[PDB]
Design a protein around this motif. Structure first.
Motif, PDB file in Angstrom:
ATOM      1  N   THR A  35       0.785  -1.003  -0.051  1.00  0.00           N
ATOM      2  CA  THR A  35       0.177  -0.026   0.047  1.00  0.00           C
ATOM      3  C   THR A  35       0.699   1.439  -0.105  1.00  0.00           C
ATOM      4  O   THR A  35       2.216   1.253   0.311  1.00  0.00           O
ATOM      5  N   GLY A  36       0.131   2.250  -0.443  1.00  0.00           N
ATOM      6  CA  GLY A  36       0.952   3.655  -0.254  1.00  0.00           C
ATOM      7  C   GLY A  36       0.016   4.669  -0.949  1.00  0.00           C
ATOM      8  O   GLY A  36      -0.907   5.103  -0.695  1.00  0.00           O
ATOM      9  N   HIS A  37       0.829   5.764  -1.549  1.00  0.00           N
ATOM     10  CA  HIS A  37       0.086   6.891  -2.130  1.00  0.00           C
ATOM     11  C   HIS A  37       0.370   7.202  -3.619  1.00  0.00           C
ATOM     12  O   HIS A  37       1.253   6.259  -4.072  1.00  0.00           O
ATOM     13  N   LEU A  38      -0.131   8.015  -4.260  1.00  0.00           N
ATOM     14  CA  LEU A  38       0.058   8.303  -5.542  1.00  0.00           C
ATOM     15  C   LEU A  38       0.993   9.450  -5.623  1.00  0.00           C
ATOM     16  O   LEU A  38       0.629  10.558  -5.300  1.00  0.00           O
ATOM     17  N   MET A  39       2.155   9.298  -6.330  1.00  0.00           N
ATOM     18  CA  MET A  39       3.110  10.159  -6.570  1.00  0.00           C
ATOM     19  C   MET A  39       2.701  10.876  -8.054  1.00  0.00           C
ATOM     20  O   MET A  39       1.476  10.651  -8.409  1.00  0.00           O
ATOM     21  N   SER A  40       3.472  11.980  -8.393  1.00  0.00           N
ATOM     22  CA  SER A  40       3.196  12.600  -9.754  1.00  0.00           C
ATOM     23  C   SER A  40       3.229  11.799 -10.830  1.00  0.00           C
ATOM     24  O   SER A  40       3.586  10.648 -10.819  1.00  0.00           O
ATOM     25  N   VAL A  41       2.227  11.972 -11.872  1.00  0.00           N
ATOM     26  CA  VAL A  41       1.974  11.160 -12.845  1.00  0.00           C
ATOM     27  C   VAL A  41       2.589  11.963 -14.221  1.00  0.00           C
ATOM     28  O   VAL A  41       2.395  12.908 -14.356  1.00  0.00           O
TER      29      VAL A  41
END
Lengths: 47, 89, 141, 180
Positions: free
Chosen positions: B55-61
């Motif tokens: 699990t984690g977070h969304l970084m820049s796309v």
RNA sequence: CGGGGAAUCAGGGUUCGAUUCCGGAGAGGGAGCCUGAGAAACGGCUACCACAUCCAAGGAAGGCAGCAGGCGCGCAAAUUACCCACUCCCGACCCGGGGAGGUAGUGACGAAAAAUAACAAUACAGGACUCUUUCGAGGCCCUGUAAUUGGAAUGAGUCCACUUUAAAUCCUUUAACGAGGAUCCAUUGGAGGGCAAGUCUGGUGCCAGCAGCCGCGGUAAUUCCAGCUCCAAUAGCGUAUAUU
């Protein structure tokens, strides 16, 4: 002292191992790369 | 996805497996979503049981974040001179 | 030398307080600007929100990059650089999170390798970094 | 407002030098001789001795015929005699300064069980003290720090409810005897 | 808010005191009153200010810096419990009332005591003593280490009965079950110097990082990260800040 003295002896040993000459070879390579000399052909006379 | 290191540099070495402590970057073609975003990873274990792995977070796309796959080739040096070696295999 | 009579008390006491204002630690305690310029405001700990991550360069003989964070305190709004303590722990800190920040240990003086950074993060999202680094607890969001 | 008291004291003082070899040496030696749990027991006895010596130092400075010096010193000498440290011959306030920590550690009920032959090891003395096997006069004491007085030194017994005493063997004898 | 006082401390002193005792002040801010011996009273009144509740839109009602509880603020602080039995107070009063107060609940603020094992025989390992040139051999010698063997003794627990108490709970007292370590298993910091305890093994390789300070890492890393061993305090021990 022992640990320091041991590291100091390591320093003196690494200082002796850190040292046509190579500086002249680097100067010739820089002069060739600068476009002043196209290529080094050979040595004509060794005085 | 493709797993990579989460460093500050440009190139990211590809990770061929998921590490239990290192925090990785999973990179994939996906519909675009604006960060922040919670991210969950599941797998079919058996009989449709969704198991949680990571699990984690969304970084820049961005597509510019290149992933580099490495291969190191080994060789056994069987002859050694001073600062010169003859290596086989 | 000194005034050393028997009726010499107020001269001695005036001299004491006047010269005691030249003491650095006493003046730092009592001028009261060292507690009004203090970012923590005389607090053992503050709590902030992460604004950005920062890599502070090491000082000359030491060669490394130290992983710091620009956080913003809740209670006054000041901007503070904080040092994430252990190896591989900056990944636990995520962008815009509650962080419990402490001093670093020299009472306002920059400590060790990190230059001008005098605070360290103790807790993230009300979980201690020591537990996360030791893999004992799990970080919510 | 409450009907309580908050008066309480710390019964030890930690040493100022944390790791010096001779201090750790002496404390570990006393731990070995007198069978104690940790260094806080040695620090506790040293702090009580420091209390007694500080009182004696405040009492020596007064004049000999001071009523306060007389009364406080004679009471203190009586107290240290009744514990079993000083001697009836040397009942002078000068001799109080010549006291050592083990002269107080010899008076613990652990060591008094050990020396008098009630047990056979000093850890054995402690394990008998904790498990309600040693009594003083008619009271089972469970504390291994009880400073035994001189009149109370004479009769320390088996605590008749104990299996070593009157009767009633414990759970292990009862269980093994009903095996068959 | 002041004091009694607190912490430290040779002597001198330094710092603190919001905080249970005494004296003072205020009940959101100011102001003015009624009644009464005693009030410029706010669990009384009247106004303005600032907030704010119910409306049928005409009006009505406020005051937790009392006890519990919430929001908010925060690095930071407990139950919307039970009772007047104790301590005392109030009244017309051997009777009534009391979030004063007591009592339990939360509570690693801090403080006192104090378990997590004791003995014996073996089996090795050393150390001395004697006999032996030595190697070696003995002891009614010593010291260690043993998921070795033997028994006994116990408390943490589960549970009765009593006691406790206003009714309980707890502590104390009894029956019943309850212990072989390969668990009913102790942690938290550390092993470069200061500063006690490793130039032990593997990993990463001036990277990651460690480190209060001095400094380490650039390949045999005494300092990083693990394991093993070890040290310090020990049911406690790290860090940050203030102050001595």
């Amino acid at each position: 002292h022992a640990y320091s003295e041991e590291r100091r002896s390591a320093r003196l040993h690494e200082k002796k191992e850190h040292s046509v000459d190579p500086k002249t070879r680097l100067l010739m390579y820089k002069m060739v790369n600068s476009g002043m000399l196209e290529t080094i052909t050979g040595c004509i006379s060794t005085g | 996805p493709l797993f990579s290191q989460h460093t500050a540099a440009d190139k990211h070495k590809l990770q061929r497996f998921l590490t239990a402590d290192m925090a990785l970057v999973a990179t994939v073609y996906a519909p675009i979503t604006f960060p922040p975003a919670s991210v969950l990873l599941f797998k079919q274990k058996s009989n449709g049981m969704h198991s949680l792995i990571a699990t984690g977070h969304l970084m820049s796309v961005d597509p510019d974040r290149m992933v580099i796959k490495r291969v190191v080739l080994s060789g056994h040096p069987f002859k050694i001179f001073t600062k010169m070696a003859v290596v086989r295999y | 030398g000194k005034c050393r009579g028997l009726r010499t008390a107020r001269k001695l006491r005036s001299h004491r307080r006047d010269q005691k204002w030249h003491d650095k630690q006493y003046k730092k305690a009592h001028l009261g600007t060292a507690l009004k310029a203090n970012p923590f405001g005389g607090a053992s700990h503050a709590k902030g929100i992460v604004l950005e991550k920062v890599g502070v360069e090491a000082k000359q003989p030491n060669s490394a990059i130290r992983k710091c964070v620009r956080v913003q305190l809740i209670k006054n709004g000041k901007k503070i650089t904080a040092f994430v303590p252990n190896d591989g722990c900056l990944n636990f800190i995520e962008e815009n999170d509650e962080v419990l920040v402490a001093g670093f240990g020299r009472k306002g003086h920059a400590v060790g390798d990190i230059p001008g950074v005098r605070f360290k993060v103790v807790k993230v999202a009300n979980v201690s970094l020591l537990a996360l680094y030791k893999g004992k607890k799990e970080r919510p969001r | 407002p409450v009907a309580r008291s908050w008066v309480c004291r710390k019964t030890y003082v930690t040493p100022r030098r944390p790791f010096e070899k001779s201090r750790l040496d002496q404390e570990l030696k006393l731990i070995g001789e007198y069978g104690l749990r940790n260094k806080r027991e040695v620090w506790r006895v040293k702090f009580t001795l420091a209390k007694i010596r500080k009182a004696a130092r405040e009492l020596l400075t007064l004049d000999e015929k001071d009523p306060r010096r007389l009364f406080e010193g004679n009471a203190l000498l009586r107290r240290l005699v009744r514990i079993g440290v000083l001697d009836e011959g040397k009942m002078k306030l000068d001799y109080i300064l010549g006291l050592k920590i083990e002269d107080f550690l010899e008076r613990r009920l652990q060591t008094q069980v050990f020396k008098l032959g009630l047990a056979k090891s000093i850890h054995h003395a402690r394990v008998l003290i904790r498990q309600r096997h040693i009594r003083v006069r008619k009271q089972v004491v469970n504390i291994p720090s009880f400073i035994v007085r001189l009149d109370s030194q004479k009769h320390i017994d088996f605590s008749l409810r104990s299996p070593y005493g009157g009767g009633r063997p414990g759970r292990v004898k009862r269980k093994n005897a009903k095996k068959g």
